[PDB]
Symmetry: none
Subunit: 90 residues, 2 copies
Amino acid sequence: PAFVNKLWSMVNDKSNEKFIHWSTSGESIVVPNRERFVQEVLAKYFKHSNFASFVRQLNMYGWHKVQDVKSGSMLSNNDSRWEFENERHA
Amino acid sequence: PAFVNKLWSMVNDKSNEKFIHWSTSGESIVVPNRERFVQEVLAKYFKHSNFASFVRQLNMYGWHKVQDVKSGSMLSNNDSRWEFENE
């Protein structure tokens, strides 16, 4: 499961904090901005790969996008912000 | 315009994983088996259509088949395996 080793080598390396990190609250991995993450981190740990390909791998290992939160009167959601939770830790 | 929504509504729906998905490899859409794809997925998202029609649509939107790779002493290629990459 090489993916796993790469995932953690990426998430648990503080140098990638601004682009991907464990959430302050709850038990989840947060990607503040999909585009910047793809540009600065994904390209480094997962050569010639894209977001959908990455997320597909995460799913394979139990991680799934968290239910979206509709904010304010606009029922808005930052489509670029992604939060992932593992099925084994709800 | 409508083909696009259909394509992604199909590719990015995890329920279609076994028939069509993003390559674990590098930036491409993979159709493990053409025949199974046609009868189990295409038949649902693109009623009254066929593989050639679908691929033609893909081509028009920038996606094309990746160069074949001949494997082993037989220089073989699984004609049913289709992988597409964007322009």
